[PDB]
Amino acid sequence: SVYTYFSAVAGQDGEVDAEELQRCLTQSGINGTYSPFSLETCRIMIAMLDRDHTGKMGFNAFKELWAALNAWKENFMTVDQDGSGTVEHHELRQAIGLMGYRLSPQTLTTIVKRYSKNGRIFFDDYVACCVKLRALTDFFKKRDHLQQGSADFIYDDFLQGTMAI
Amino acid sequence: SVYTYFSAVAGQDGEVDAEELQRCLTQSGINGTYSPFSLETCRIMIAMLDRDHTGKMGFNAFKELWAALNAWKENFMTVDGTVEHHELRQAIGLMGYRLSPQTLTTIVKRYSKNGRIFFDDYVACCVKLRALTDFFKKRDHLQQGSADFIYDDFLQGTMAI
């Protein structure tokens, strides 16, 4: 019943903005026993799939988001050794590697320190991390024309993309 | 009594993490009638002044933040709980940012709700614009308005902010 939750909050244009996406996801109960999603997290979700640069999301893109969310949640449940509903530093760093990222120790530490609350990473931040990593990497890859692991950005292009995400 | 609010929530290390900063600012009343700052906004505030990379902020940095916050708040209260699309663009330009029409629209579209911008979002925008520009400026050695980023460095800076 993915469509039921989506259509219940979509605007007359048949799309959801971040606030409506938050409402849709919350009503769907996809987070299960974990924390519900925050508006910021949903804003990053919109950015991740915002190919039209509109701040909105149609159902086809939502379907893609839904499947990705299903996947990241499973990964969370997998690395969440204990039940708790929150993961420890080591488990987050592990999850990131599990998703295919090869980040330096310093970078992983930066990510951990931004989200850590009493040494734990809550579900909303875990997902925000997954979505933001993907969106920033997609954005970066498009400017890495020679496929070298480097990119040269013009200020206005850099600011547009990073402010959006 | 800025220090009073700060020290009331600061940790054993004399610094505040994002959650403590959120509490500090709320208890300080800087928010007034407007809606309190979100955890995300406070996280960007820390990132903006996180020179030693710890995800925490000491009082000296907080003093700088407090001054900036008060200034952006005045603009919000005197450049008009929300503002409109036309006014946000205005504020961005006034802060010295000369961006393209598309870039300004993209920024406005991320926060816009029913055509309005809430106080928390207005400030988040101000803080993020400053953090990102500082980060970018540091890689623009020739000051050409362009900057190289090695993937890992790019991710570290943008995930922190």
Question: Which domain CATH number covers A51?
Answer: 1.10.238.10
Give the span between the Cα atoms of B97 and A35, in whole angstroms. Answer: 37
User: Is-contact A139 A165, C-beta < 8 A?
Assistant: yes
Measure CB to CB from residue B19 to each of A103, A117, A163 and give the nearest one. A117
- The per-residue DSSP string of A76-141 comes to HHHH--SSSSEEEHHHHHHHHHHTT----HHHHHHHHHHH-BTTEEEHHHHHHHHHHHHHHHHHHH
The answer to whether B120 is a known ligand-binding residue is: no
Using only C-alpha atoms, chain A has a radius of gyration, in whole angstroms, of: 16
Indicate the residue type of A118. Answer: N
Give the span between the Cα atoms of B125 and B121, in whole angstroms. Answer: 6
Tokens (6 digits) for B153: 């460095």
The approach used to solve this structure was X-ray
| Structural domain of B160 | 1-161
Measure CB to CB from residue A162 to each of B53, B146, B158 and give the nearest one. B158
Contact yes or no for B150 and A150 at CB 8 A: yes
Going by C-alpha positions, the residue among A137, A48, A111 that lies closest to residue B157 is A111
3-state secondary structure of A17: coil
Nearest CA in chain B to A51: B106
Give the span between the Cα atoms of B92 and B122, in whole angstroms. Answer: 10
Give the span between the Cα atoms of A34 and A22, in whole angstroms. Answer: 15
The answer to whether B19 is a known ligand-binding residue is: yes
Tokens (6 digits) for B50: 């996180």
Looking at beta carbons, which residues of chain A come within 8 Å of B149? 140, 150-153
Contact yes or no for A116 and B55 at CB 8 A: yes
- The per-residue DSSP string of B108-161 comes to HHHH-BTTEEEHHHHHHHHHHHHHHHHHHHHH-TT-SSEEEEEHHHHHHHHHH-
Number of domains in chain A: 1
User: How crowded is the C-beta side of B4, counted as CA atoms within 13 Å?
Assistant: 4
